[PDB]
Amino acid sequence: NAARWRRGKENLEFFELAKLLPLPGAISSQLDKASIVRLSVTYLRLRRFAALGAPPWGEQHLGGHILQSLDGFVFALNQEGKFLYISETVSIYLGLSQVELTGSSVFDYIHPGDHSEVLEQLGLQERSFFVRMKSTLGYKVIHVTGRLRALGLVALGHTLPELPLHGHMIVFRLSLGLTILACESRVSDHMDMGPSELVGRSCYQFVHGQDATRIRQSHLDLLDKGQVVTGYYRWLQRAGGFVWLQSVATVAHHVLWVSHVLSNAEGSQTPLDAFQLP
Amino acid sequence: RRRRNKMTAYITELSDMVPTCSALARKPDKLTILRMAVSHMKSLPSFLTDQELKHLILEAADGFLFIVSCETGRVVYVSDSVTPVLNQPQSEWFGSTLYDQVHPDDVDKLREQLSTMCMGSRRSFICRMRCGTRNGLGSVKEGEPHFVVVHCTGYIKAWFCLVAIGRLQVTSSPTEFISRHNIEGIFTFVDHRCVATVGYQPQELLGKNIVEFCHPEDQQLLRDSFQQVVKLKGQVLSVMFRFRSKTREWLWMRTSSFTFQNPYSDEIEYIICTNTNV
């Protein structure tokens, strides 16, 4: 009977705590007690986390433009792995709620078995890995790129990668071993080879020798998780030299290899490979 | 049940994150913890201020917000984050042209974006950008200007202009020289560093066998080691031998090499040597 009054005062307080969260009225108002406390805690924790790190964090239309300008979501983990922040835009790509993830362990949303590798990346100083995350739109391959701090990750998640090609990007169709099956005739706008002189050979023949090992690791991740993004690598040209590419690749038991052309030819005098002679 | 002990576990940690409430010997009642949190937060676009968000994008992937006009290319807005990312002063970037700030060869692509394509239409492109008072697309030249590879994502939004993030994707850019051989030991690729390492030009090695450049006392070891790295599958095997430079001097040379196995078909693409001077 006194418990009723005590709980009434507690409820009133929960209402207040909900009002003060940095959320829209319409969202915070519809929260339950447990989640009001969770968001309150991790939000104070977030304040602490941005306090640390250099600099301390801090035309006013800016943040809206930043968030809707990224093709992915932005997030910050603590040393444990709990989300201290995730941008509402996660809903665009994974359909998870920002309100649902905030305060939660990232591993509750990573495909298990990528758990080991993710645990390795946080240390449990740049980071860059591919991981499967829970999507409800039954996983999505998410490219994470960010920084570790020596104790918490700050990073961007981008879904991979409908098919809008533009001018400076050639499509390849490759086997699962990266031999060239088909090539856009457009390749000749950026390279010396035509689709006649490329089909039948393996991309490993065209990767500059210094990038063979990086491309290989990317090929591993491609067979492992189904999508991959290479680093900037060099593709050797028929005379000499190479053109720089970055490539996004997805499996369909065949491989789609979208190469953004990053530069014109470089050092085209000196040949490097056998196929560049005579 | 498991829900109530869970919330008390929330509430106590809330007492820890509330200052006026943690600096107590005895933890107060739930109602007072709530009350204290409510006033604490009362003494203080979601979770993060626009400033905070700007600095987070900066920490996460070296990103800065900029706005350009879709026909002239005039930088109508640039974040101050452009200084840590590009080492451009804000004033040099503001009002300048985007076409003047990108690399001479990347202008055509920058012009095929931003040309006339509705409102809220998206743009995404990679293009190099001048640093001024660090490069990331191949070995840095000598006394030339630095150009970092910048990843632009954005949307179209009139008073017609492009709202974008440029962000750096550093984990992509990459005394000795790499080479490739067939299983018989035949040079089928030589990176250019070989000129500076053993004086020769890549084609002056291509097509010949490595043992031909090998001191006669050492040739039997080198033949043996090659036949060995073939039997070793992936694993690396190193050997030191004497290499006849183009100055006809013998250089002691530690080459570690391994057989490069296609991550799908597992066939041998070639043998990757990393030849070093000791």
Author numbering:
A (entry chain B): 52 to 109, 135 to 200, 244 to 256, 267 to 279, 282 to 292, 298 to 388, 397 to 422
B (entry chain A): 99 to 142, 156 to 227, 255 to 271, 290 to 315, 335 to 349, 361 to 464
Per the authors:
One family of transcription factors in mammals is known as the bHLH-PAS family, which consists of sixteen members including NPAS1 and NPAS3. The mammalian bHLH-PAS transcription factors share a common protein architecture consisting of a conserved bHLH DNA-binding domain, tandem PAS domains (PAS-A and PAS-B), and a variable activation or repression domain. Proteins in the bHLH-PAS family have to form pairs in order to bind to DNA: NPAS1 and NPAS3 both interact with another bHLH-PAS protein called ARNT, but it is not clear exactly how this works. We employed the contiguous bHLH-PAS-A-PAS-B segments of NPAS1, NPAS3 and ARNT proteins for our crystallographic studies.
For the NPAS1-ARNT heterodimer, we obtained crystals that diffracted to 3.2 Å resolution. We found that the bHLH, PAS-A and PAS-B domains of ARNT twist along the outside surface of the NPAS1 protein. Figure 1D shows that NPAS1-ARNT and HIF-2α-ARNT heterodimers are very similar in overall architectures, but the PAS-B domain of ARNT is slightly displaced in the NPAS1 heterodimeric complex. We show that NPAS1 protein’s PAS-A and PAS-B domains do contain internal cavities with volumes measuring 190 Å3 and 180 Å3, respectively. We could not detect any major change in the cavity size or shape of ARNT’s PAS-A and PAS-B pockets, whether this protein was in a complex with HIF-2α or NPAS1. Mutations in interfaces 1–4 were found to significantly destabilize ARNT’s heterodimeric interactions with both NPAS1 and NPAS3, as predicted from their crystal structures. Point mutations within NPAS1 at interfaces 5 and 6 also destabilized heterodimerization with ARNT. NPAS1 has been shown to function as a transcriptional repressor on its target gene tyrosine hydroxylase (TH), since it lacks a functional transactivation domain.
